[PDB]
Amino acid sequence: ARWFPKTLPCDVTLDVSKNHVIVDCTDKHLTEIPGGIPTNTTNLTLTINHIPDISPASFHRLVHLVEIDFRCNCVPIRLGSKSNMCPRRLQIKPRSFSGLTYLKSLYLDGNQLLEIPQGLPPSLQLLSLEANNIFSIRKEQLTELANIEILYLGQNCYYRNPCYVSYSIEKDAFLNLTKLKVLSLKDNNVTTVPTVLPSTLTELYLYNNMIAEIQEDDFNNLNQLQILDLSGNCPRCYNAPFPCTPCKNNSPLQIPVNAFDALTELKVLRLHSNSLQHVPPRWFKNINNLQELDLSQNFLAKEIGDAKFLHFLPNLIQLDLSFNFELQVYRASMNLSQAFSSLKSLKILRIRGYVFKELKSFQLSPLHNLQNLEVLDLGTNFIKIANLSMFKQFKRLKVIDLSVNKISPVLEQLYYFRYDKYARSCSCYKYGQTLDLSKNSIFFIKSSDFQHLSFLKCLNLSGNLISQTLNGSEFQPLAELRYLDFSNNRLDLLHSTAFEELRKLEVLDISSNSHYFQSEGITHMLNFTKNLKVLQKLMMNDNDISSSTSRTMESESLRTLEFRGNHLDVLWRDGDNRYLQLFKNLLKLEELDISKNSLSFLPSGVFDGMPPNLKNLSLAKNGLKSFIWEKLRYLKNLETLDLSHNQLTTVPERLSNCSRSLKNLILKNNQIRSLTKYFLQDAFQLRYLDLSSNKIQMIQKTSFPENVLNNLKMLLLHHNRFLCTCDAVWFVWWVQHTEVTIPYLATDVTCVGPGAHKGQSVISLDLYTCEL
Amino acid sequence: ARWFPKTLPCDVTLDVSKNHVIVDCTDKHLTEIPGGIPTNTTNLTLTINHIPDISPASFHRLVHLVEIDFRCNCVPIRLGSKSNMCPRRLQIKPRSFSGLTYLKSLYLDGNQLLEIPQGLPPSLQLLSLEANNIFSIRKEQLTELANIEILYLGQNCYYRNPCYVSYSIEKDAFLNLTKLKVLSLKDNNVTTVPTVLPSTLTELYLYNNMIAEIQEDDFNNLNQLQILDLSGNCPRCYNAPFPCTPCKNNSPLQIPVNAFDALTELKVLRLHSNSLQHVPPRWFKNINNLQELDLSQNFLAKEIGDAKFLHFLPNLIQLDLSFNFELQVYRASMNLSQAFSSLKSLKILRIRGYVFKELKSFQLSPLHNLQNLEVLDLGTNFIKIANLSMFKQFKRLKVIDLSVNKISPVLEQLYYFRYDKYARSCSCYKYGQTLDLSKNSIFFIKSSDFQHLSFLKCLNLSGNLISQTLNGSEFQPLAELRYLDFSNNRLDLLHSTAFEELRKLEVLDISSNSHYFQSEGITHMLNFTKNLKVLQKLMMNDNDISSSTSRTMESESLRTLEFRGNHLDVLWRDGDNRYLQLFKNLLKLEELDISKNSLSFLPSGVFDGMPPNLKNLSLAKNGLKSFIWEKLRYLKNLETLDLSHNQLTTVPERLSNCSRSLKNLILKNNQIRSLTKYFLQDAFQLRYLDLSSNKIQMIQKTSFPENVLNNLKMLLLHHNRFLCTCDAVWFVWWVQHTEVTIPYLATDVTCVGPGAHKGQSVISLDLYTCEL
Ligand SMILES: *[C@@H]1O[C@H](CO)[C@@H](O[C@@H]2O[C@H](CO)[C@@H](O)[C@H](O)[C@H]2NC(C)=O)[C@H](O)[C@H]1NC(C)=O
Ligand SMILES: *[C@@H]1O[C@H](CO)[C@@H](O[C@@H]2O[C@H](CO)[C@@H](O)[C@H](O)[C@H]2NC(C)=O)[C@H](O)[C@H]1NC(C)=O
Ligand SMILES: CCCc1nc2c(N)nc3ccccc3c2s1
Ligand SMILES: CCCc1nc2c(N)nc3ccccc3c2s1
Numbered sequence A, B: 001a002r003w004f005p006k007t008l009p010c011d012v013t014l015d016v017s018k019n020h021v022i023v024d025c026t027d028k029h030l031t032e033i034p035g036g037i038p039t040n041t042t043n044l045t046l047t048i049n050h051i052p053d054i055s056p057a058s059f060h061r062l063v064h065l066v067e068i069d070f071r072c073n074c075v076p077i078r079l080g081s082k083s084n085m086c087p088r089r090l091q092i093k094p095r096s097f098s099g100l101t102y103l104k105s106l107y108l109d110g111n112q113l114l115e116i117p118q119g120l121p122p123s124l125q126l127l128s129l130e131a132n133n134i135f136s137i138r139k140e141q142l143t144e145l146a147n148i149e150i151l152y153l154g155q156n157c158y159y160r161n162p163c164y165v166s167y168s169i170e171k172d173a174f175l176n177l178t179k180l181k182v183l184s185l186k187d188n189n190v191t192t193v194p195t196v197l198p199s200t201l202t203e204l205y206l207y208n209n210m211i212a213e214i215q216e217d218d219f220n221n222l223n224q225l226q227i228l229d230l231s232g233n234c235p236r237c238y239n240a241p242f243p244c245t246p247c248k249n250n251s252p253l254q255i256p257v258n259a260f261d262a263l264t265e266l267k268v269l270r271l272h273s274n275s276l277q278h279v280p281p282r283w284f285k286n287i288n289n290l291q292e293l294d295l296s297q298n299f300l301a302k303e304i305g306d307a308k309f310l311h312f313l314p315n316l317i318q319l320d321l322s323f324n325f326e327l328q329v330y331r332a333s334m335n336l337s338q339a340f341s342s343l344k345s346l347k348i349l350r351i352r353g354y355v356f357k358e359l360k361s362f363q364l365s366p367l368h369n370l371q372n373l374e375v376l377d378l379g380t381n382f383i384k385i386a387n388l389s390m391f392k393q394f395k396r397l398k399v400i401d402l403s404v405n406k407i408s409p410v411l412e413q414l415y416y417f418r419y420d421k422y423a424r425s426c427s428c429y430k431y432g433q434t435l436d437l438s439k440n441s442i443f444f445i446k447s448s449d450f451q452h453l454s455f456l457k458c459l460n461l462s463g464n465l466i467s468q469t470l471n472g473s474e475f476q477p478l479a480e481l482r483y484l485d486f487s488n489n490r491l492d493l494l495h496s497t498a499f500e501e502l503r504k505l506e507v508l509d510i511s512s513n514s515h516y517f518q519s520e521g522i523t524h525m526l527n528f529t530k531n532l533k534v535l536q537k538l539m540m541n542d543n544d545i546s547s548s549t550s551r552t553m554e555s556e557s558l559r560t561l562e563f564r565g566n567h568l569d570v571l572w573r574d575g576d577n578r579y580l581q582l583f584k585n586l587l588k589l590e591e592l593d594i595s596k597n598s599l600s601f602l603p604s605g606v607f608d609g610m611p612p613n614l615k616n617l618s619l620a621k622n623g624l625k626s627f628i629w630e631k632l633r634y635l636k637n638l639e640t641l642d643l644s645h646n647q648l649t650t651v652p653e654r655l656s657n658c659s660r661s662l663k664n665l666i667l668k669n670n671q672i673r674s675l676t677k678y679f680l681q682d683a684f685q686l687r688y689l690d691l692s693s694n695k696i697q698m699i700q701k702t703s704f705p706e707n708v709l710n711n712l713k714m715l716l717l718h719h720n721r722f723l724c725t726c727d728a729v730w731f732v733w734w735v736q737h738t739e740v741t742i743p744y745l746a747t748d749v750t751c752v753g754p755g756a757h758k759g760q761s762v763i764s765l766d767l768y769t770c771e772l
């Protein structure tokens, strides 16, 4: 099927449209650039390997290279692996790049380089040198970059990669880079804004440095600047999770009132963690296009009640005023200036970490007529009191976020407090209006608590303290609710009428409501599903369900049931038949997850008891030690079977004879040591087979008929125990010449033996001695 | 050190005391009785093997056998492994036991026997046949048991081991068993009490059967009976976790009013789950010695408010009325009859599952003058209101249990509801008075909540809804508290004054209070420990701690700190030195658990940062990929180092150079593939070494000098990858001949090769070809 097997340890892709031959050698544990890279190579990535030097031999035949991605072949010690530390810096010999006359993009990040590499071709638009050791920039070393448009030099002098001096930039070092659009000098122990910069700049990143003052003319010529980030200069260090040095005397970064006067094109201004106490309106006199303003992690608590500068921001789309609270102050309420009402274009307002006790309808009145307002984020404010009905005036919003508060009767986890959220490494909103009350202190709910909110489509009550029996009266206003996240509470299913007032409910999450399931003898009405006539998806993961008063759950609508992390092993205790049809009357059910239920065996009757349209079944992570494969015949619509992370030792003698419908068979992470002689014979439906991470020693042709392998979209075989003796001649030859997609041939389809061949990839294996 | 290596795959112990030779072959995957069993063997256990038959050859030389424990060599099929089912029942040939003329105890449980084995010696006092298929007892078949004292025949006909008919016992089958003290016929589908029974009986177990009526004279001659259990006849089936058939007409077990008149000696009466609605006082007029009465799982809800029968029980110690509630009734209060006040000897009263809304001092008055009352258990009652001060009147008690209730302003998990609490298979109480409020709904605490309870020594608040900052004022009444379990709440360590009013506190558990530690930017005062001057043990496990406002925790008293399941990997992020002395000022800390902290490496300074008296250090389950063993020099009092379940690949070149103090080195479950040349040389201090579940191939004498192994109390070596070539000659020889204790030599210390030897035990390995 192939005449010339591919030995090269890299994935090779063709994009015929834009004549790219893409060679990806990412993370292939290479010590040398592999031989045989196609000479038509346009994109070549060698990121995360251990190639210790580059030379003219490196790319010698690769004349058409347009991009070389050579990041992280010698990561700085504190940022890289401690088990495989890099012994010496990358070495780049002369002329290594000069012949590549079409090279447009060169990334050399994370290689412990000490200088800007010279000899670069004049075609280069993008040079990336992050996380190296270059902390002195001289105009001489930048003459070669005449046509450069994007230049990343950050992370070369900071706490994860110290240089122990101030960064240095000669005057007008960048000024003759006349074509330069993007300059990044973040995380560099820079002490002043470098001047003069080329007026072609559209983006300037100077954040996380030691710039204490802006000079009035530091940005005088940047009439095309669109994004400017000065954050993390004079940081606000309270509860910082990284080493943090504030400016002396609690000074802020000092910005003259006229410092921005030239930036007419500015669209994004970021002044995060600059220890600001005031925001002069004069700052924005000449910026009418500003769309995004980050003022998080300053000391603007008082200014938020005044905030005259908002009158100069009629086109602002995003405003972030999070974490401006005064230390050790717990304000009574939020004092939002009337000036917010002049934010006519505002879509997103974030004020986390203002820290106040009580939220009242009128305090949000400055926002009532912001017509384009879509997201209001008041999370992490320790609000104790809030009448939810006030959001009846905010029905136009897409998300109201009150997450992580103490109310009673999507951004990264680390976001406002991480050092460099843009650091490069080597959900129910779609349903409509969302009220996020997650991680609050609601211990009891009542119908009137939701009143005037019948417009809500998604309500997140995850992670409250609700230890209550529901009887159908608690949610009555919520006539349009489609999604209820009730996870991480203490739901008590005493009555089978719970949730029945949510007539339009399509998704219910009651996972991690294990509390009342963990004490013996307590009544549990699992048959509450019957009353929910449009319910599509039910999640009850991690509930430790080991007993149930009702014997059957019923639904004519339910399509997906997640039941992972429970104790079906106890419910189905061998000899107890009462619950073998717990799911039989979920008539429309197509997907069932009963992984992690400690099912080390399946009792008689489990398969016969499944609902008739079951398509996707997971029995993963059960400690399954045995499996009667014939009983799949009961599952006449079964299309996906996930048996991963179990203890199986055998596959069926004839998979076609067990399931005529089975299309995807997942057996990864088991104990299988051999395949049956006619395993896949006539399994014409099979499309996907994962046998990886087992203990298979040999595979013979009878098990793998090629009319079956031809239809496989993927066949996974890596991390097994293959013996590369002359008995493996067909398997080795087939693996080398087949077109079937088999991931990891280059890294993890290997011989364990015999002696000579140990550790060797079967793709590279030469068995001519077997036919002498 | 030994002249004759032990081949026998059984543990052999001598108790010269009573001259017994104990051979224990439990769970050794035997298909045979091993050859070579010592001929002095007195106790021989073969439990959990797959020996298919017994014969006269089985024990023929084992003349002095006093006990044969042969359980579970063919378990009933729903009770045993489904991956290794037993193919055919155990076969016992004639004459197998007749020569064993000293045999006193014979266990044959769980072998699928169809009849009581005949031919047994007349010395036998104890015969055990539980979980077989013997469901017809004939007087003829018990002639051989003249001198029997203890006879277990239960679990031969029940839902885990069905016989599909009623149990049958011929009339007077047991009466000529004139020495029979204990007869157990539980779990047997028995329909009537067998008569006549021998009057020597002291214990009679008839529970979990189908007995509908007791006859007047069913116990007429029992004269000496001390324990009688009739539980589970006419069971109360509501929320039963096993198949449960109630008696018709909701009838109770019918017991005539005079049925117990002969039982002068009766000390324990068990009538659990008999569906009783009344307890006629006349039952007890002739039993004044009764000490333990179980009336749980009946319908005694109203009877508890009357209970005149309590007047006849002045010597009762334990009384159980748990789960007597009327279905679908949520009573307003608990109505205890005054008759309780006449239980002058009562030590333990349990009334779970009475199910009522409000508890008031006034309802507990019948117990005020019960002088010996030690345990009051009102758990699982769904109590919503309870003034804790009422217990000022119960300070003589050892435990007050309000666990699993809804209060807001040790028995097995499965106990009242499991089928057979006594089924045989193949804590702060010690600190003083304990108020157990675990698993309630307390969301806010205040000093007055504890008024008048200054006597408390242990308070259990685990698993409430406490989401509160503590400032040192909340517990002030609890002047003598020694133990506070605050686990599974949402503690907010805003103030370092938390818990300081507990001036006597020795153990503080704030594990699983992760909530506020999981959201970025929140203040955490881990240095709150300084104020706790007698604090001994601090558990802050599973808190997801990844940030801290203070840099150091301080205590002059704390000895043990459990810090497992947190994120020291983040706190000690490489490049951030600020928290490398988090534990340095716990001056007298001796045990530190920092397992499960994702520490894939230890930054330099962690060890120097440890407090000076650190004795027991766990770094288990961190994914540690490397370890600078030399830094153990900083830990000069280190005695236990637990590095289990990591990814280490090497041991120190010179363990004596790394620690002159280390006694226990646990390296189980790592990736170690060889030992260093002189690993343990001069490690005279080492006493315990676990290298199990690694990839070690060979061990040479240089690494294992015998001056070091002589002192080892245990050396764990199993589940490695030993190569049994002529290079292994010394290791094989030493293992076969050594004194030193090595677990699993018979089952999991094995050669992986070379061919022929694969799978073979190194204890059985013959390497004579290596010396031809
Ligand atoms: C940023 O530059 C400062 C100096 O401007 C470096 O600080 C010096 O560091 C050395 C070595 O730690 C000290 O001996 C000097 O006293 C420091 N000088 C001053 C003025 O503080 C600092 O190390 C640089 N930062 C990084 C992360 O490399
Ligand atoms: C206990 O004995 C009863 C009979 O007393 C068994 O019930 C019979 O079971 C067979 C087979 O299932 C049925 O055909 C009979 O009709 C049943 N008879 C009655 C009267 O119920 C029962 O199976 C036995 N229980 C156990 C656990 O072995
Ligand atoms: C053995 C207890 C049987 C019961 N189960 C529950 C329950 N899940 N919720 C309640 C809520 C209020 C009152 C009583 C209850 C009871 S009583
Ligand atoms: C917002 C980040 C700084 C803060 N941390 C906490 C905290 N642990 N508990 C509180 C309790 C009440 C009010 C405010 C707080 C704050 S404010």
Ligand SMILES: *[C@@H]1O[C@H](CO)[C@@H](O)[C@H](O)[C@H]1NC(C)=O
Pocket (backbone or CB within 6 Å): A020, A022, A042, A043, A066, A067, A104, A105
């Ligand atoms: C390939 O490299 C070129 C040159 O930098 C780049 O513009 C393009 O986006 C890359 N495409 C892929 C698929 O790698």
Ligand SMILES: *[C@@H]1O[C@H](CO)[C@@H](O)[C@H](O)[C@H]1NC(C)=O
Pocket (backbone or CB within 6 Å): A302, A303, A305, A306, A335
């Ligand atoms: C809110 O704060 C502003 C600025 O500090 C102050 O001028 C104003 O009086 C305050 N108003 C209210 C209603 O608190």
Ligand SMILES: *[C@@H]1O[C@H](CO)[C@@H](O)[C@H](O)[C@H]1NC(C)=O
Pocket (backbone or CB within 6 Å): A387, A388, A389, A390, A392, A452
């Ligand atoms: C909450 O506000 C609404 C106004 O929309 C009002 O009807 C209701 O009474 C308020 N509830 C409370 C408890 O203040």
Ligand SMILES: *[C@@H]1O[C@H](CO)[C@@H](O)[C@H](O)[C@H]1NC(C)=O
Pocket (backbone or CB within 6 Å): A403, A427, A428, A429, A438, A439, A460, A461, A462, A463, A483, A485
């Ligand atoms: C609800 O919020 C929790 C916690 O913030 C989050 O994990 C979950 O994804 C949210 N639910 C939905 C449906 O988005």
Ligand SMILES: *[C@@H]1O[C@H](CO)[C@@H](O)[C@H](O)[C@H]1NC(C)=O
Pocket (backbone or CB within 6 Å): A471, A472, A473
């Ligand atoms: C359900 O409970 C609520 C609150 O306890 C109550 O208002 C309502 O009447 C109850 N419904 C029924 C049918 O009892």
Ligand SMILES: *[C@@H]1O[C@H](CO)[C@@H](O)[C@H](O)[C@H]1NC(C)=O
Pocket (backbone or CB within 6 Å): A496, A525, A527, A528, A530, A531, A549, A550, A551
């Ligand atoms: C659910 O099952 C319980 C337990 O048998 C039953 O009492 C109740 O009526 C059922 N309810 C529904 C809605 O099916």
Ligand SMILES: *[C@@H]1O[C@H](CO)[C@@H](O)[C@H](O)[C@H]1NC(C)=O
Pocket (backbone or CB within 6 Å): A633, A657, A658
């Ligand atoms: C499986 O194979 C046997 C033998 O060919 C055949 O009789 C049977 O119909 C096949 N299919 C099923 C679903 O049993």
Ligand SMILES: *[C@@H]1O[C@H](CO)[C@@H](O)[C@H](O)[C@H]1NC(C)=O
Pocket (backbone or CB within 6 Å): B015, B020, B022, B042, B043, B066, B067, B104, B105
């Ligand atoms: C040995 O067996 C005898 C006979 O049943 C038993 O009484 C005794 O407790 C056992 N002793 C030991 C040390 O195992």
Ligand SMILES: *[C@@H]1O[C@H](CO)[C@@H](O)[C@H](O)[C@H]1NC(C)=O
Pocket (backbone or CB within 6 Å): B302, B303, B304, B305, B306, B335
């Ligand atoms: C308590 O229950 C008893 C028993 O039925 C009844 O006679 C009595 O009236 C009840 N007393 C109270 C105070 O409820």
Ligand SMILES: *[C@@H]1O[C@H](CO)[C@@H](O)[C@H](O)[C@H]1NC(C)=O
Pocket (backbone or CB within 6 Å): B403, B427, B428, B429, B438, B439, B460, B461, B462, B463, B483, B485
């Ligand atoms: C407190 O109660 C919990 C919940 O039942 C229990 O797990 C824990 O062991 C108790 N604490 C102590 C110190 O006994």
Ligand SMILES: *[C@@H]1O[C@H](CO)[C@@H](O)[C@H](O)[C@H]1NC(C)=O
Pocket (backbone or CB within 6 Å): B496, B525, B527, B528, B530, B549, B550, B551
């Ligand atoms: C705990 O540490 C914080 C911050 O380092 C400090 O403000 C506070 O006073 C300390 N409290 C103690 C040591 O009790």
